[PDB]
Each structure stands twice: as structure tokens, then as C-alpha cells.
């Protein structure tokens, strides 16, 4: 029922290699075509990738910014309120970003804000304009 | 086995069941109650045992009954029936033994036996043992036929049969206690030596051999499991199957390679897409950073939008730097994955040129053992005899196998140098017309009740015929002769004054340059105490090295030997001999094989004796006049000595049943 281990003898394969005088050498040639053509395609993509890797040379070390360590404080300043409103205008409902901009208000505090001042800051109007973009 | 079961096995018989044969002669018993079958079976086994335990002296029915105990020695008709059946069909009192009852004063019936081959000689001894008149007709000047033995001085070497293929149920066991044959085992270790004279390294030798054995199983699988036994309109040879298998192995190796490099490109193209993302990020990053500088340029105090801008851009930029850092983690994972795929590639090739060459020597050993190119063997059927293989070490006859035929011929009437040219068989008898081989004109005629033809299949195959059958042999028989295979193999005897090879190694191989010449001088035997080396030719090569002179062949031989043991260690041979069996007119080849398009069943067709048309039209169906025996007639042991021997014993039995009747069948 089973070929010896490491011999591979398919019904379909047998018919394929036997059907002609040299359907056998045919099949084993077109596998040398496929093989050499894939090895060529590897060369193109190795070369292509090597160029793109030299475009990224230097990493992004020149563009990275050191980190601000500020502690999440419950008091809104008017500064911070205004930051918020603009941050909304630009960021819609993304709390992580708005928290990151203000730099001393946790994500919760921001949602809170959203409801607290919604009336006085028309966070409605602000948000439907964010949507317009 | 051992005990009585040991006799039954040692006589190629199941200890615990009745054979098809025995059913025919004891159909009362085998249709009867179980209990009596086991009595019979014990008796058979027991009598066999006795014969075997001392095969140098005839075993009488009296001495047999005397050794039995009750219940088994009660029914003495049964004991008699058994002992007679065994006597008749050569299971006991066969070969060379001290007869107790001297031979019948008067003989009955007359049988002419063509050829004092081992089959011939075996039959003859039996028939004359049975008391029938027997005369043997041998074209050759000596008995043995394909058992030829070269002798000169103390050099002794078979150019014909050399080996007893195991003693486990081999009748030649019996013979060997009757004739003193210097039986000696064969150490099966065979070191190879490439083209150049370099021993093949154990690494390779083991790898290649295993691949061989694997390839064989493969064929067997193609045969039975996939039914690849007929290709196109023709049958498939072992050769084609092996090619197709090997083609499919090289195919796989490329398929492996293909899908492995296709992994690499599919990965490489992921990496490519990742790098384009990474570059277009690095560009938005440069640009954002610039904007964030330009927005920190504006100096405090600044209004709130300006402050927003700085903070905004600061956040937008650290988002993108975060994203880019996680792309560069990804990049590292792929780039190492690719270094691992580069590191672990599938094998480059199925087999190298050096590998294939070694694999060819393993095929040449197969070609030698079958005596023919694997392109001639039947895929399905070549191996069919392998089931009946004997158990035990293979052995050589050290003092020459001819000792056996010679000893068998003692006491027989053998006409040497008498070349049968025509066999005439009719309802009323037979005449055989021979000539003298020395003098083609001088003519002999022999008349007899029956003719036993041991003519080698090569001969029976001859066109135009060396022997003429009157009337012609039936189409069913001629087609059997035509379909069956007769092969060729050759030996080169190299007799040297001093031993320069390894005295503890019986045989070593030489690997051929090409596929074409793999068989050519591919193997050497050192079995003889004396300093003799045998070189064997096989496969397609044997058939061609018959056309090359001995000086040239011995040349090529020494070449190879010098290459393996060095120019100053290999003398000239004192004596050289080279077989050509396909040339020999009395063999016309070496032995049989199961050609493609042929079945084990043809070996039965060959044994089937022939019954002539009636003399007077509308007269009763006559007796069967012509009988065949020999290596090519025994389906279960072809191409062997023991096979022949057995076939001889079988026709002797059948002939005497015909011509002296069977007392046992009642
Ligand atoms: C090189 C070689 C090595 C072998 N090695 C082994 C081995 O190692 N082990 C093993 O078990 N078997 C071996 N065999 C096979 C074995 O020897 C034979 O199958 C066996 O001897 C067959 O005996 P036979 O009686 O059928 O035919 P043969 O022994 O050939 O008998 C036929 C006889 O008929 C004669 N004859 C032919 N034509 C005529 C004619 N027209 N008129 C009168 N007589 C004629 C022949 O000359 C011969 O004497 C080997 C064979 C060969 C060639
Ligand atoms: C007559 O000599 C041989 C017969 C053999 N028969 C067999 N039969 C194996 C059974 C069938 N296989 C397809 C599995 N195997 C051998 N080596 C593995 C044999 C090896 C033999 O000699 C080396
Ligand atoms: C299927 O397994 C095998 C069967 C074999 N059968 C044989 N048979 C010998 C041929 C029998 N007669 C035609 C003489 N020989 C082998 N190696 C030399 C064999 C070798 C085999 O594999 C090792
Ligand atoms: C059919 O079964 C087998 C037959 C075999 N025949 C042979 N013949 C070569 C002779 C080995 N000894 C009897 C000396 N060898 C085998 N292994 C080395 C065999 C191994 C076999 O299978 C286990």
C-alpha cells in the first residue's frame, strides 16, 4: 500500500512520465526552466531590496524626539482646554492622540471632558466638521 | 524446523498438509476424516526422516515399517502406499545409494534420454532404479552439461554451475552426503573498487546499496500496487520500471527545489513590500520633523494655535516613529527567516555520476544473477522463484562440481559424442536419430517406448532447428519456448602462482565506467584454496565479450586487477580459460529467465509431456510418448542444478507411472 519511505511514486506522475517516448525528458526539462527562471526572479528581488535597504541607510535616528514624562493632572487649565478643542477638530474622536497632545491628561479624563464641556465647546459642531475632512 | 517436521521441510513439503500430488494418489485419505490424514502425514514425514538421516543406503519398505510404532504401524497397506509413492517421486532412494535388493534381473520398457545433463542423469538413475531400460544420448564428450569444471594441474574451477544456493530443503544436501563434495561457505562481503582502482568509501557503498534495494521495492510497488505491468501494447520489463522509478526520483528532487526557492521569492516579495512602506514612512518622517522644527522656531510667548501646532506635530511624528520601529522589527524577522531558508536547502541531485556508476554495479549484479539485461526480465514475474529459496549459507564446491554428474553417471549407459538430430514419436513408439559429432555422416537409430528430452532451452529455441520433431511440437509448446527467456553469463578463470588479493575476502567488485559496460568484468571470486581468481561478465556485456579474443579479455582483466592491487603485485596468469555459453552449440546460452511477456506458467507448459495422434484413425487415445525435463521445466526452481535434478526425478516418476503403472494409487 505504501512506497518505500523516501521514494515518491504517484499514479498521476507515472502516467505523466510514461505517456510518450520522451514525455519524461520533457517534464524534467520544464522543471529546469521553472527552476532557473525562479532563481533569476530571486536575483531581481535581492538587488531591488538591497537598493531599498541602502535608501533607509541611517535609520530614523536624526528624526526621533526625546520623551516628555509629564504626570496626568486632574485640573484643566484654559491652555489645556484650548489644546483639547483644537485636538478634537484635528483628531476627531481619537482619545489616545488627544491625550498624547495635551501630555498630562489620561484617556479617561479626555472622555470625561468630552461630555463635561460638550455644551460650552459645541464638541458636536467641532466633531461634524472633523467628519467633513 | 526439527524432528519429523524437519524432514518435511528438508524435502520441500508442508509437514502439516497434504500436497496436490498426494491428493491425486491418496484421494481416499484427503477426502476422508482428519484423524487418518494426520496418520498419513506422520507416516510420510517419518519415512522421509529415515531416508534423510541416512541417505547413503536404500530404505526398504520392511526397514520402514520396522521403525514405525502403533497406531502408525497398524495399517500396513497405508505404510506401503506411502513408501512406494515416495520412492517413485524421488523423495527417497534418489541419488547414489547402496541398494539392498539387487536390481531386477529383467528390465521392462525402453527409454531414450536426450542429454546427460543433471536432469538427464537424475532421471536415468531413477528409471534404471525402477528397472526400466535407459540409454542417454550426449552430444558433448562428457556428462554434466552446464555443470562444467575446468581442471589442469591443481587448478580446479567451474565455468558452469559453482554454487549450492543454501542447504535448507535443498536436495543437493542429500547428494552431498552421498558424494564427498568439499562444500565451503561464501563470505558475502564484497568491497567495490571504482573505475580508477579506489575502494569505494563505506559512506557511499552503504548509501548506494540502500538506494538500490529501495529502487527494487519501488518496482515491485509499481507492479502490484499500481498495476504498471503493461505499457503501450507491450509488457513492461524490470528495466523500464527502474527507469520510470528513477525518472520520478529526479522529478521529485527538482519539485523539492522548485517549491523551496518559491518560498524564498514569496518571502523576498513580502520584505520588498515592507521596505516600500518603510521608505515612504522615512519620507513622511523627514518632512514632519522639518515642520516640527519650523513650529518650534516660533518663539515663546506664542498663542495657543501655535502651541497646538508644536504639540500636535510632536505627537504625529512620535506615532510615525513608533510605527516605523515595528516595521523594522518585522524586517528583522523576515531577514533571519531568509537566512535560515538559504541555510537549509533540499538536495541538489537525485544521484551523481559516481553514485549512478555504483548503482550500475548493483544492477550488473542483478543482471548476472538473472543472466540477462534487466530490459528483458518481466517486471511482475522475474522474482517469482524467490519464495522457494533455500535457507543457509551459499556454498562452493571446492573440488569442482563435475564430481556430481560424474558420480551420477556411474552405472549408466551413456552414448558420448552422439548428437540427436531428430525425434520421431508415434502412437506405437519412438525412434531417435543421432549422428556422431566427430563424424557427421555416420548415423545411429534408437527405438524406444518413450523419449525424455533434457535439451536446453537454448537448443529448443534454435532457428533453424538443431533438432527436428516428428511430428512438430504443438503451437502451445513452441510459443512457450519462444516466450520464455534464455540468458547468458560468462566466466574468466585466472590461475596464478601466488595469492595477491585478500585471502579472507571471497569476492570483490569493479565498477564500470559507463552504463553500457557495467557488467563487463564487474566481479571477482576467490573461493578456491589454490590461487585462482574468477572474473564474471554479465548483462549486455556477456553477449558481446564472446566476440573478443581471450588474450584481449585477460588483458582488460589484468588492467582492472593492477589498478586495484598495483602494477608490481599482479603477475602473468599461468593458465587462462574463458567461457562462451551463448556460442556453445549444446547449451546456446547459460540458463533461463522469465522474459517480459512471459509467466511462471510457461515453465509448466515446458514440462507437459506430448501425446501423438493415433496411428489408425479413430483408434483409442494413445499413451504420451514425449517427455521434457530440465532447468527450464521446473517453475519453482528454475535455472538451478537442484532445479534440474528435481525435474529429472519428476519425469522419471511420471514415466514409470505411465509404463510400469502405479500400485500406490489404490
Ligand atoms: C555459467 C553458469 C553458472 C551456473 N551456476 C549455477 C550455480 O552456481 N548454481 C546453480 O544452482 N545453478 C547454476 N547454473 C544452472 C545449472 O547449471 C543448469 O541449469 C543445470 O546444469 C541444468 O541441467 P539440464 O540437465 O537442464 O541442462 P544441461 O545440464 O545443459 O543438460 C543438457 C544436455 O544436453 C546435451 N545436448 C544438447 N543438444 C544435444 C543434442 N542435439 N543431442 C544430444 N545431446 C545434446 C548438452 O550437451 C547437455 O549434456 C549455471 C549455469 C551456467 C551456464
Ligand atoms: C536469491 O538472492 C536474494 C533474494 C532476495 N529476496 C528478497 N525478497 C524480499 C521480498 C520482496 N520485496 C519486494 C520486499 N530480498 C532480498 N534482499 C532484501 C534478497 C536478496 C538476495 O540475495 C542477495
Ligand atoms: C526484491 O528483493 C530482491 C530480490 C532478489 N531476487 C534475486 N533472485 C535471483 C534470481 C533467481 N534466479 C532467476 C536465478 N536476486 C537478488 N539479488 C541478487 C534479489 C535482490 C533483492 O533485493 C536485495
Ligand atoms: C526473501 O527473503 C530474504 C532473502 C535473502 N536472501 C539472501 N541471499 C544472500 C545470501 C545470504 N545468506 C544466506 C548467506 N540474503 C538476504 N539478506 C542478506 C536475504 C534477505 C531476505 O529478507 C529478510
Curated annotation (Swiss-Prot), chain A:
Span covered, complete protein: 311 to 443 of 485
Note on domains (UniProt): The SANT domains may bridge the nucleosomal substrates and the demethylase KDM1A.
PTM remark: Phosphorylated by HSV-1 protein kinases in case of infection.
Organism: Homo sapiens (Human)
Name the UniProt record assigns to this protein: REST corepressor 1
Interaction with KDM1A: region residues: 1-74
Organ and tissue specificity: Ubiquitously expressed.
Family designation: Belongs to the CoREST family.
Record-annotated SANT domain positions: 71-122
Cited function: Essential component of the BHC complex, a corepressor complex that represses transcription of neuron-specific genes in non-neuronal cells. The BHC complex is recruited at RE1/NRSE sites by REST and acts by deacetylating and demethylating specific sites on histones, thereby acting as a chromatin modifier. In the BHC complex, it serves as a molecular beacon for the recruitment of molecular machinery, including MeCP2 and SUV39H1, that imposes silencing across a chromosomal interval.
Lineage: superkingdom: Eukaryota
Coiled coil ranges: 24-59
Gene (name only): RCOR1
Oligomer and partners: Interacts directly with GFI1 and GFI1B in a RCOR/GFI/KDM1A/HDAC complex. Interacts with INMS1. Component of a BHC histone deacetylase complex that contains HDAC1, HDAC2, HMG20B/BRAF35, KDM1A, RCOR1/CoREST and PHF21A/BHC80. The BHC complex may also contain ZMYM2, ZNF217, ZMYM3, GSE1 and GTF2I. Interacts with REST. Interacts with the SMARCE1/BAF57, suggesting that the BHC complex may recruit the ATP-dependent chromatin-remodeling SWI-SNF complex. Interacts with SOX2. (Microbial infection) Interacts with herpes virus HSV-1 ICP0 protein; the interaction leads to the disruption of the BHC complex, thereby preventing the BHC complex from repressing transcription of viral genes.
Subcellular location: Nucleus
Curated annotation (Swiss-Prot), chain B:
Modified residues (Phosphoserine): 441
Domain of life: Eukaryota
UniProt note on tissues of expression: Ubiquitously expressed.
EC number per UniProt: 1.14.99.66
Effect the entry attributes to changing residue 119 to P: In AIMAH3; uncertain significance
Modified residues (N6-acetyllysine): 262-263, 266
Domain notes: The SWIRM domain may act as an anchor site for a histone tail.
Protein name in UniProt: Lysine-specific histone demethylase 1A
Species of provenance: Homo sapiens (Human)
Gene that this polypeptide is encoded by: KDM1A
Amino acid at each position: 500500500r505504501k512506497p518505500p519511505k523516501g521514494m515518491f511514486l504517484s499514479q498521476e506522475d507515472v502516467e505523466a512520465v510514461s505517456a510518450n517516448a520522451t514525455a519524461a525528458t520533457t517534464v524534467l526539462r520544464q522543471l529546469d526552466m521553472e527552476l532557473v527562471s525562479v532563481k533569476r526572479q530571486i536575483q531581481n528581488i535581492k538587488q531591488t531590496n538591497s537598493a531599498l535597504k541602502e535608501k533607509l541607510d541611517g535609520g530614523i535616528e536624526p528624526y526621533r524626539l526625546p520623551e516628555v514624562i509629564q504626570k496626568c493632572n486632574a485640573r484643566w487649565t484654559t491652555e489645556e482646554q484650548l489644546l483639547a478643542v483644537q485636538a478634537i477638530r484635528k483628531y476627531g474622536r481619537d482619545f489616545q492622540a488627544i491625550s498624547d497632545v495635551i501630555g498630562n491628561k489620561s484617556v479617561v479624563q479626555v472622555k470625561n471632558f468630552f461630555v463635561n464641556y460638550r455644551r460650552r465647546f459645541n464638541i458636536d459642531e467641532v466633531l461634524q466638521e472633523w467628519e467633513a475632512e | 524446523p526439527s524432528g519429523v517436521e524437519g524432514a518435511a521441510f528438508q524435502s520441500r513439503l508442508p509437514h502439516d498438509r497434504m500436497t496436490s500430488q498426494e491428493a491425486a494418489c491418496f484421494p481416499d485419505i484427503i477426502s476422508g476424516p482428519q484423524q487418518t490424514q494426520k496418520v498419513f502425514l506422520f507416516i510420510r514425514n517419518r519415512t522421509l526422516q529415515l531416508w534423510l538421516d541416512n541417505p547413503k543406503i536404500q530404505l526398504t519398505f520392511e526397514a520402514t515399517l520396522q521403525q514405525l510404532e502403533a497406531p502408525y504401524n497398524s495399517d500396513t497397506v497405508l505404510v506401503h502406499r506411502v513408501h512406494s509413492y515416495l520412492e517413485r517421486h524421488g523423495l527417497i532412494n534418489f541419488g547414489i545409494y547402496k541398494r539392498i535388493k539387487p536390481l531386477p534381473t529383467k528390465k521392462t520398457g525402453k527409454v531414450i534420454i536426450i542429454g546427460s545433463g543433471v536432469s538427464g542423469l537424475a532421471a536415468a538413475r531413477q528409471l534404471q532404479s525402477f528397472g526400466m531400460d535407459v540409454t542417454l544420448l550426449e552430444a558433448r564428450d562428457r556428462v554434466g552439461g552446464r555443470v562444467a569444471t575446468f581442471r589442469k594441474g591443481n587448478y580446479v574451477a567451474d565455468l558452469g554451475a559453482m554454487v549450492v544456493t543454501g542447504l535448507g530443503g535443498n536436495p543437493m544436501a542429500v547428494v552431498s552426503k552421498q558424494v564427498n563434495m568439499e562444500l565451503a561457505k561464501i563470505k558475502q562481503k564484497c568491497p567495490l573498487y571504482e573505475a580508477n582502482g579506489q575502494a569505494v568509501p563505506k559512506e557511499k557503498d552503504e548509501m548506494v546499496e540502500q538506494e538500490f534495494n529501495r529502487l527494487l521495492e519501488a518496482t515491485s510497488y509499481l507492479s502490484h500496487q499500481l498495476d504498471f505491468n503493461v505499457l503501450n501494447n507491450k509488457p513492461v520489463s524490470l528495466g523500464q520500471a527502474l527507469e520510470v522509478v528513477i525518472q520520478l526520483q529526479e522529478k521529485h528532487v527538482k519539485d523539492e527545489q522548485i517549491e523551496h526557492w518559491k518560498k524564498i521569492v514569496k518571502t523576498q516579495e513580502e520584505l520588498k513590500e515592507l521596505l516600500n512602506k518603510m521608505v515612504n514612512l522615512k519620507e513622511k518622517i523627514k518632512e514632519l520633523h522639518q515642520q516640527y522644527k519650523e513650529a518650534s522656531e516660533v518663539k515663546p510667548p506664542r498663542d495657543i494655535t501655535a502651541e497646538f501646532l508644536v504639540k500636535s506635530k510632536h505627537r504625529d511624528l512620535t506615532a510615525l516613529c513608533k510605527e516605523y520601529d515595528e516595521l523594522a522589527e518585522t524586517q528583522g524577522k523576515l531577514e533571519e527567516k531568509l537566512q535560515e531558508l538559504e541555510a537549509n536547502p533540499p538536495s541538489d541531485v537525485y544521484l551523481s555520476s559516481r553514485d549512478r556508476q555504483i548503482l550500475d554495479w548493483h544492477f550488473a549484479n542483478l543482471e548476472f544473477a538473472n543472466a540477462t539485461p534487466l530490459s528483458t526480465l518481466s517486471l511482475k514475474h522475474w522474482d517469482q522463484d524467490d519464495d522457494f529459496e533455500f535457507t543457509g549459507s551459499h556454498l562452493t564446491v571446492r573440488n569442482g562440481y563435475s564430481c556430481v554428474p560424474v558420480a551420477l553417471a556411474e552405472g549408466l549407459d551413456i552414448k558420448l559424442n552422439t548428437a540427436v538430430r531428430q525425434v520421431r514419436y508415434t502412437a506405437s513408439g519412438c525412434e531417435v536419430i543421432a549422428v556422431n559429432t566427430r563424424s557427421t555422416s555416420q548415423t545411429f537409430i534408437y527405438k524406444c517406448d518413450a523419449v525424455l528430452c533434457t535439451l536446453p532451452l537454448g537448443v529448443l529455441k534454435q532457428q533453424p532447428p538443431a533438432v527436428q520433431f516428428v511430428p512438430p511440437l504443438p503451437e502451445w509448446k513452441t510459443s512457450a519456448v519462444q516466450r520464455m527467456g534464455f540468458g547468458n553469463l560468462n566466466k574468466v578463470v585466472l590461475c596464478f602462482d601466488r595469492v595477491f588479493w585478500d585471502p579472507s575476502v571471497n569476492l570483490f567488485g569493479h565498477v564500470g565506467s559507463t552504463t553500457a559496460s557495467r557488467g563487463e568484468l564487474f566481479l571477482f571470486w576467490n573461493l578456491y584454496k589454490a590461487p585462482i581468481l574468477l572474473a564474471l561478465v554479465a548483462g549486455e556485456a556477456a553477449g558481446i565479450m564472446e566476440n573478443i579474443s581471450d588474450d584481449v579479455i585477460v588483458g582488460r582483466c589484468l588492467a582492472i586487477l593492477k589498478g586495484i592491487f598495483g602494477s608490481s603485485a599482479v603477475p602473468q596468469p599461468k593458465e587462462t580459460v574463458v567461457s562462451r555459453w551463448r556460442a556453445d552449440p549444446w547449451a546456446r546460452g547459460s540458463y533461463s529467465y522469465v522474459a517480459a511477456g512471459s509467466s511462471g506458467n510457461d515453465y509448466d507448459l515446458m514440462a507437459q509431456p506430448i501425446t501423438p495422434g493415433p496411428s489408425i484413425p479413430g483408434a483409442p487415445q494413445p499413451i504420451p510418448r514425449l517427455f521434457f525435463a530440465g532447468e527450464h521445466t521446473i517453475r519453482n526452481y528454475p535455472a538451478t542444478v537442484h532445479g534440474a535434478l528435481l525435474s529429472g526425478l519428476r519425469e522419471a516418476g511420471r514415466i514409470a507411472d505411465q509404463f510400469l503403472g502405479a500400485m500406490y494409487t489404490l
